Amino acid sequence: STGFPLELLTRPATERLAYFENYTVAHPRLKEVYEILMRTIAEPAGASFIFVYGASGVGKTTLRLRVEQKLTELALPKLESDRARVPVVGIEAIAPESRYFNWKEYYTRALITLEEPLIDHKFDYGVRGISRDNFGKINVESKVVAPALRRALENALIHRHPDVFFVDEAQHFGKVASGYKLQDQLDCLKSLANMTGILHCLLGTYELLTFRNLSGQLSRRSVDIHFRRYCADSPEDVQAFKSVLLTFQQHLPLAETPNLVDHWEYFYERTLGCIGTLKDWLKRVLSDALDREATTITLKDLQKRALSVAQCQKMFKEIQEGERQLSETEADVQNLRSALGLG
Amino acid sequence: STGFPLELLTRPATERLAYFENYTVAHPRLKEVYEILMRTIAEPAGASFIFVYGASGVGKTTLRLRVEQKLTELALPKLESDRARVPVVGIEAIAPESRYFNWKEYYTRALITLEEPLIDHKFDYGVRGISRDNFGKINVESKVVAPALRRALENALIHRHPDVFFVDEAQHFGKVASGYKLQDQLDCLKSLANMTGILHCLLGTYELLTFRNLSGQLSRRSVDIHFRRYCADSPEDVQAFKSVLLTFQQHLPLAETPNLVDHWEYFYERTLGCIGTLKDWLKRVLSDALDREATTITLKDLQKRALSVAQCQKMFKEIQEGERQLSETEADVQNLRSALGLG
Amino acid sequence: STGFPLELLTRPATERLAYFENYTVAHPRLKEVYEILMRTIAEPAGASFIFVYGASGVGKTTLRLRVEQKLTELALPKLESDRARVPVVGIEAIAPESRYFNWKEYYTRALITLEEPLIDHKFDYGVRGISRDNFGKINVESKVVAPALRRALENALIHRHPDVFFVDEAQHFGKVASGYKLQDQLDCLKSLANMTGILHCLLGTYELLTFRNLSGQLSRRSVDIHFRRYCADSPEDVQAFKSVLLTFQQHLPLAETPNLVDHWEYFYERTLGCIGTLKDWLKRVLSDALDREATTITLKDLQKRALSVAQCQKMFKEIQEGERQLSETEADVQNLRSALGLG
Amino acid sequence: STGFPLELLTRPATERLAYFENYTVAHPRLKEVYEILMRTIAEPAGASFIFVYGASGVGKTTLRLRVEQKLTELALPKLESDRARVPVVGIEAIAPESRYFNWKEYYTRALITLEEPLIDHKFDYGVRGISRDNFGKINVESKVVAPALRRALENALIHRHPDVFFVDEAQHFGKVASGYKLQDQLDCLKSLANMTGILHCLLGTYELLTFRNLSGQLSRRSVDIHFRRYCADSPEDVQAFKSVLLTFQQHLPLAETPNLVDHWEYFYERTLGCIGTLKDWLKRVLSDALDREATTITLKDLQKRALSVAQCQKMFKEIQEGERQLSETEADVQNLRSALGLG
Amino acid sequence: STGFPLELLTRPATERLAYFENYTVAHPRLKEVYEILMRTIAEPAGASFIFVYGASGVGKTTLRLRVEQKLTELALPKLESDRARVPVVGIEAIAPESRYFNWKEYYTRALITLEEPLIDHKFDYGVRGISRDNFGKINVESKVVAPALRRALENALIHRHPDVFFVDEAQHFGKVASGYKLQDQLDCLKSLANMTGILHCLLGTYELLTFRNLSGQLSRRSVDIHFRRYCADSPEDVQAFKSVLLTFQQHLPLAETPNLVDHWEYFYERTLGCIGTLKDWLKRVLSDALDREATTITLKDLQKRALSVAQCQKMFKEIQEGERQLSETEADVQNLRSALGLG
Ligand SMILES: Nc1ncnc2c1ncn2[C@@H]1O[C@H](COP(=O)(O)OP(=O)(O)OP(=O)(O)O)[C@@H](O)[C@H]1O
Ligand SMILES: Nc1ncnc2c1ncn2[C@@H]1O[C@H](COP(=O)(O)OP(=O)(O)OP(=O)(O)O)[C@@H](O)[C@H]1O
Ligand SMILES: Nc1ncnc2c1ncn2[C@@H]1O[C@H](COP(=O)(O)OP(=O)(O)OP(=O)(O)O)[C@@H](O)[C@H]1O
Ligand SMILES: Nc1ncnc2c1ncn2[C@@H]1O[C@H](COP(=O)(O)OP(=O)(O)OP(=O)(O)O)[C@@H](O)[C@H]1O
Ligand SMILES: Nc1ncnc2c1ncn2[C@@H]1O[C@H](COP(=O)(O)OP(=O)(O)OP(=O)(O)O)[C@@H](O)[C@H]1O
Ligand SMILES: [Mg+2]
Ligand SMILES: [Mg+2]
Ligand SMILES: [Mg+2]
Ligand SMILES: [Mg+2]
Ligand SMILES: [Mg+2]
C-alpha cells in the first residue's frame, strides 16, 4: 500500500500518534537540498562555512538530523577500524541573556557536546581547568578564560576531526552591540574553522542573510544553500505541494481517509508552503481527532488548530524579504561581466 | 439543591466566607479556553509558546491552577509509577527593581520551584555552585553566573520533562532597556524551550501583546489563545453574564437570597464582564454583610465596595486597545490570500 | 465630666502636657475612614494595594497607629495559642540620598521590622548573609544582593503571614528618572505583594496621586480611600469642625477653660480642615501658656505660634489639586455608560 | 607526457582525488612573488616587516607552505652541524572574540608553536610561569601577565633566531577599539621585532592595506609584496590564465580530457582570476563527476559548484578598491620629485 | 686605496656581504652630531635630557652604538682601576600592547640591562623582591610593585654611576590616553634622572618632538641635537651626498665599480638623503648582484629593491612637517628680545 498500515486501527491512539510523528515524507526541495549538503560536506575543498538558509517550516532541523544519521552510518564501517574519531558533532546556538552573544558558553557547550565518546578515548585537553570526572562528563570551571576554552576546543577538534560541525539556530550569532562586531563574530568563526580545518554548517532562518556577504575572504569560503519553500505562482511547486498533501492524507491513520487536496488553498494560506508547518498542523488535527475518536477530519478541525492570520502575515513579510535578497537574476551576471570587462 | 447548602446558616460567618472563597463558577468562556489550553498542552507539535491574553479581573490564574491540578491528577498514575517526574511546573514572573529584567533571578527561581521532589531523587546538577542542603532546599550562591544557572536549569528540565511550563504575568518580560531587546528576550526564552523540549506557556495581561508577533520563527512556535471578556453588544454574552450572576446569587450563604440579576447594568459597568472582578465585588459585599450579620444584600452595600469610575475607565482603555489589536476579521484573510496569490 | 480631670491642676506642667499629647480626639471623618479601612483590610479579596490619600494635616499616621493597635489587640488570643505569627507590620518609605529609590534599604528595613519576635522562632532564612546574632538582632551583610534580600523578605512574609503591610509616607517611591520607571516601581510592589499574598496599604500625601491609575492591572488590584479634609462649603463639615474644636477646648488641662469657638474662622484659615494641624497648634499654644504658668490663653498666643500665610496657601495649592483629581462626579458615571454601551 | 599519469584511471576515486588535491601548479605571478619573497627573506637589510597583500584565492597560504619547506630544506645541511636554531616559525593571527585583539593569546601561542623541538633543547626561559611538561609541550599558566610572556618570547626568539616569523591571516590585527590604536598595534609588533632582530612576514587580504604606510618609521622597515591576480584588460594575464586552465584540464584524472579554454570567460567570471578559488572549484567538480563515475566534466557541473554571483560581485568590489590603493603611476613619481625639489 | 680591498673578489659572497655591512662611512653631518653629543656627554651642566631628533634613516642607532663604544674604550683605563662602574648603559623603549606605557616593564628592563656585569659585584639592592640567581641573571617577581622597582633602579644607578642612559625610539613614551599625560611621563623621566644625577639621552623619530618644550622646567634642563638629513636646495649637502655615494661605490665588493654619480637624483629621491636607508638599499642590491654573480649593479636592480613612492611620500610628509617645527630663524629672535624688553 501507499499509505499507513491498516493494522494500526486496532491499536490505541498513542501508537497511531507516534507512527504519524516518526513518519517523514520526501519532497523534491528536501531531497535536492540534502543532496547539495551531502556533496558539499563530502568535498568541502577549502570551504569552512555552509550557510543553510530557509524559512520556518522548511525542515532545517530534520535535514540536519538526517544528514547526521547518514554520516554516522557511513562512517561506522571505518569507525570499526579507526577510533578516536567522531563522524559529526551538532550543537545549537544559544540566544544570550545579555545584549551580546557570549562566547564562553558557546565554547564550553561545544566542548561538552563534542566530547561524549567512550571513556577509552583519552586526550588530556589543554589548560588545567578542563578535565574528565567519575561520570564521563566534561568538567569546565569558571576559572578558565575564554581563550583557554578556545584553545582546548581547538585541540579537541583537531584530535577528533569531525567531518562537519553543525551549528543550529545560527541567527543567534547576530546578538551584538556594534555593527562591525557582526562581521567580527564571523571572522572569529572563520579563524576557528581555519586553525582546526573543520567544516562548519550554519542552519538558520532568513535573518541569517545579515551574514551573507561581508569581507571577500569570508565570502570565498562560504557555500550558500537555499531551502526554498513551495511558491504558489509556479504550477510545478503547486503540484508538488498537492502531492505532499495527497501522501499525507494517505498516511493519516484514520478509519476514513479525508479529502485534503480539495482545500489545498487553505492549507497553503496557513502554511505558506512550508512542509514542517503542514506536518505539525496535521499532527494537531490528527491528535484532536484521535482524542475525539472521530473516524475522520473536517475543515472545522483544521480551523481549530490553524495559524492566525497575523501570525502568517508576519511570516510572509520575512519570507518575501529573504527571497528578495537571495534572488539571483541573469541581469546580475551582466553587471558582473560588465564590471570585469568581459562583456 | 442548586444553591448553597442550608446547614451553613447555623455554622458561623468564617466558614461561610471560606465556602464562598473556595467556590468556583463555570462559564462558557472559561471552559472553552480551558479545553483549548488542555488540547494545546496535550501535544505542542513543534510549538514552544502559548500566549494567553486577557483583561485583569478575569480568571487567568484560576485557569492556570485548574490546569495544573487536572494534569497532576491525570499524570498521577504515571507519577506514582515512574519516579523522577514532575507533571507541571508553574512559575510567575518577577518585576525587577532595576530597569532590566533579571534573568539570574528567573533561573534561580525556576531551580527553586522545579526541584522540590522527595529527597531520594539526586542529580548533583552541573556547575558546582548549586547543591542540596540538610533541609532539602536548593542552595544557589551569588557566585554562580547566569549562564551556569541556565545550563543547570536546562539539565533539570530535560530530565524531569514537565508537560507544560507556566510563566504567569509574563508581561514583566518587557522591562528592558533597549527597544529591540524585546525580541532578544523572547529569543532567549525560545532557546531555553528548544534544547529542553519543554512547552512554555506565557500567562499575561494585554501588555503582553508587545511580544505577540516578533520575527517569523517566534510566530511559528507560538499559539494565541484569547481569554475574551463578556462583551455587551452581543446578546449571548449578556445572557451568559446574567446566568453567571444568577449562579453567584444562588450560592450566597445568606438567610435570604438577594435578587441580583436585576441590577446587572451596574455590575457590567463596574466589572466590564470579567468574572474575577465580579467575584471580588461579591466577596467584599458578602464579607461586609456577614460582619453586620444582616439577613441579605442591598445596592448600598454594593456601592461601598464598588470600583471607582476613574480606575474602571483606565481598564476599559487598556481593554479597548488590546481587543482592537487582537481582532482578526475576514478582511485580514483577503490580503493574506492576495499577497500569496491565492485570491 | 466630658473634659480633663481636675486633678491634673496640682500636677506639674509636664504631666498636663503629656496628658494633652497622648489624648486623641475622634471626628466623623476619622471614624468613617477607620471603619472603611478596617472593612477593607479585614479581607482584601484579590486586592493588593490600598491608597489612603490625604493632606499633610489630617491624621494618616495616627490612623495607622490606631489600626495597628486594634489588630494587635484582636490577635492576642490566637498568638497565645499559635507562635511564629505577627498580626500587623508596617514601615515608612525612605527618601533616598541619591536620585533613585534604594530598594536594598527598603527590603532590609522591612526584614528588620518584620523579624522582631521572641528568640524561639527560628526559620533559618535563605541567603547566607541573613541570620540572627548574639543579641537577637537580624544582621544584613552589604555583600547580599538585592534579589536575595527580596527572596528572604518573601519567605519571611509567607511564614509570618501578616494581616496587612503598612507603607507610610509612600510618596517617596516616586524618586525616579524615567517615565516608565514611575510605573515599574509600583509593578515591583505588586509583584512583591502577589508572590506573598499580603495586602499592601500605602499611606501618603497627595503626591501619591501620581500612582493613582497606571494600566488596568494596577487599576483593578487597588482600592482608593480618600481622607478628605473638613471643607468650609459643607455646613455639616463646619459643624463637625466646631464640635472637634469645642472638644479640644474642653480637654485643655487649663485652670480656666477659654472660649475657643469664637475664632473658628481664624482656626480654619490656619488649618483649612486638617485636624492634626489644629491639634499640634493647640499643643503649641497650651505648652506656651503653661511655660508662663498663666491661667489662660489669648488670641495673640495663637497668633504667636500659628502657621504663616506663605506656607498655609501652599498646602491649599496641593490640596485643591488632589481633591480635583479625586473628584468622582455623575458625569463620569454616564461617560462609562456611553463608552461601554449601557446607556 | 605533460598531463596526468594515465595509470590513475585504474585507481579508485580516493587516489585520484588525493592526486589532484596535492598537485601544485606553477604560474608566472606565483613564481615572481615567490622569487621576490625569497630575495627579501635572504637579507632583510634593516627591515622587520614583509607585507604580502593578496586577494581571496591567490595562494598566500600555499606560498607560505612552499617557502617554509624551501627554508627548512636550505637550513637542513647546516642544521646537522648547528643546533639551537629553527629555520622558520609559522603562525596565523587569531580573530578575537572581544572587540580588541588579544596580545596575551598571541604571545602564548607564538611560544607554543615556536617551542616544539626535540626534548634535548632546554633554555630555562624567563618568568616562572612558563616551563615544559611530561609530554614535552610548553605549559603557560593563566597568572602570567602579558609583558612577562613578551619577555619570554623575546628570549626564545633571540636564542633560536629563526630566519623569518610568519604571521598568517594578519588581517585580524586590525580588530581594535580606538581609531589610532592601529599605529600602536603595529609599533608593538615593530618593538617585538627590533629586540630580537627577527624578520616578520604578515600575510593577509587586501584589507591589510590599512597597515601599509600609517607611519614613516614603520614605512621604512616594511616591504610591500603584491600577490596580484590575473587581470582581463591586459591580454598577457588573459593568456596566462588560459594556459593555466589548459594545464589544469590536462592533468584532471578523468577518462576523457575535458575542454575548458572555450569558457575561459565563464571560469574568469566565477574566479576573478584567482588561482586557489579555481583549484577548489575544479576539485569540487572532479569530486562530483567522480561520484557519478562520469568520464568527463559537463558545463552544468561547473554551474553546480560555482560560487554565487553575489559572492563574486562583492569580491571584485573589495579587490578593485584594494588595487586602487596599491596603484603606482608616473604621476606619483612627479609629485615626489616636485615635493623633494628634484624637479 | 680609497676603495674596497681587492682580494675580496676571490672570496665567496658571504665574506663580501659581511665586509659591506660592517663597513661604516663618515659624513659631515654624522661627524658634527657625534662631536656635539660627545661634548654634551663630557659635561651635562645641569641638563638632564639629551633630545636627539632624526628621521628614520639618519643613523641614530649606529651613532648611539659608536658613542657607547667610544665611551667604553675611554673608560677602560679607569675601569681597570675602579670596579663597579659601568661606563654607558643603553636600553630600548617598548611599544606597549595596551594604550598605556607600562612603566613597570621599562623599570625592570632597565634594571636587567644595567645589571649585567660579572657576578663579583654583590650590591644588595633595596626592596626584598629583587635579587640575583644561580645563573647570574636577576629575577623580579610580579608581586613587586613598580615604585619599589623604581627605587631599586635609583639605588643601582647611583651606585654604578653611568655617564649616560641611552633610550632608543623614545617616542614610545607618547602612548597614553590622557592629553596632559605627556607632561606626566616627561616629569617622571626627569624625576628619575634627577636624584640619580644621570644624563638621560633620548633618540627617536620626528614624532619625538611632542615632548620638545612641553614645559619650562623640562625646556631648560634639556638640550636638543638635530640629526638633519641631506637636503637639495643647499648645494653643500648635495655635494656631501655625492661624496658619500662615491665612497659607497668605491667600497662595493664588485669586479666593476658602478657609476652611482649619474643617478644621484634617483637615489636621493628613493632615500631622501638618509645614509642608513641608502646603505640598506645598497645592501639589498649587492646581495642580489652576488646571487646573480653579476660584476655590476644595473639600474633596474636598484628599482627592484627600492622603496615604493607611497612609502617615500609618507617619509617626506613627516620629515617636512617636523623640520618647520625644528626651524629657528632670526625672526624668532627679535620677538624674544622684544618680549623680554631687551630690544
Ligand atoms: N520532510 C519532513 N517530513 C516529516 N516531518 C517533517 C519534515 N520536515 C519537517 N518536519 C517536521 O518539522 C519539525 C522539525 O522542525 P523543522 O526542521 O521543520 O523546522 P525549521 O522551521 O526548518 O527550523 P527551526 O527549528 O529553526 O524553526 C518536526 O515536527 C518534523 O516532524
Ligand atoms: N470562574 C471563576 N469562579 C470563581 N472565582 C473566580 C473565577 N474567575 C476568577 N475568580 C476569582 O478571581 C480571583 C483570582 O484572580 P483572577 O484569576 O480572576 O485574575 P486575572 O485577572 O485573570 O489575572 P491577573 O492577576 O494577571 O490580572 C479569585 O478571587 C477567584 O475567586
Ligand atoms: N483625630 C486626631 N486627634 C488628635 N490628634 C490628632 C488627630 N489626627 C491627627 N492628630 C495629631 O496629628 C499628629 C500626627 O500627624 P498626622 O497623622 O495628623 O499627619 P498627616 O499630615 O495626616 O500625615 P503625615 O504623617 O504623612 O504628615 C499628632 O500630633 C497627632 O496628635
Ligand atoms: N598554485 C597552487 N597550486 C595548487 N593549489 C593551490 C595553488 N594556489 C592555491 N592553491 C589551493 O588554495 C588553497 C590554499 O588557500 P590559498 O593560499 O589559495 O588562499 P588565499 O585566498 O591566498 O588566503 P586565505 O586562506 O586567507 O583566504 C588550497 O586548497 C590549495 O590547494
Ligand atoms: N654611517 C653609516 N655607515 C654605515 N651604515 C650605516 C650608517 N648609518 C646608518 N647605517 C646603517 O643603518 C642601520 C642602523 O639604523 P639607523 O640608525 O641608520 O636608523 P634610523 O632610521 O636613524 O633609526 P631607527 O630605525 O632606530 O629609528 C644599519 O643597517 C647600519 O648599517
Ligand atoms: Mg527546525
Ligand atoms: Mg489573576
Ligand atoms: Mg501624619
Ligand atoms: Mg589562503
Ligand atoms: Mg636606526
Question: What's the layout of helices and strands?
Answer:
The structure is a homopentamer of 343-residue chains.
Chain A: H1 13-22, H2 28-42, E1 49-54, H3 60-81, E2 88-92, H4 103-114, E3 130-131, E4 139-140, H5 146-160, E5 164-168, H6 179-196, E6 199-203, H7 216-220, E7 222-227, H8 235-250, H9 264-271, H10 275-292, H11 299-304, H12 309-325, H13 330-340
Parallel strand pairs in A: 1-6, 1-7, 2-5, 5-6
Antiparallel strand pairs in A: 3-4
Helix pairs in contact in A: 1-10, 4-5, 8-10, 9-10
Bound molecules: adenosine-5'-triphosphate (5 copies) and magnesium ion (5 copies).
CATH topology of the largest domain in chain A: Rossmann fold
What is the 3D form of chain A? globular
- Bound small molecules, which ones? adenosine-5'-triphosphate, magnesium ion
Distance N to C terminus of chain A: 57 Å
The top-level CATH class of the largest domain in chain A is: Alpha Beta
Helix fraction of chain A, binned, reads 40-55%
Which two chains form the greatest contact, residue counts included? D-E, 47 and 58 residues
PDB class: dna binding protein
Keywords: TnsC, cast, DNA binding protein
Assembly: pentameric
Entry title: Cryo-EM structure of TnsC oligomer in type I-B CAST system
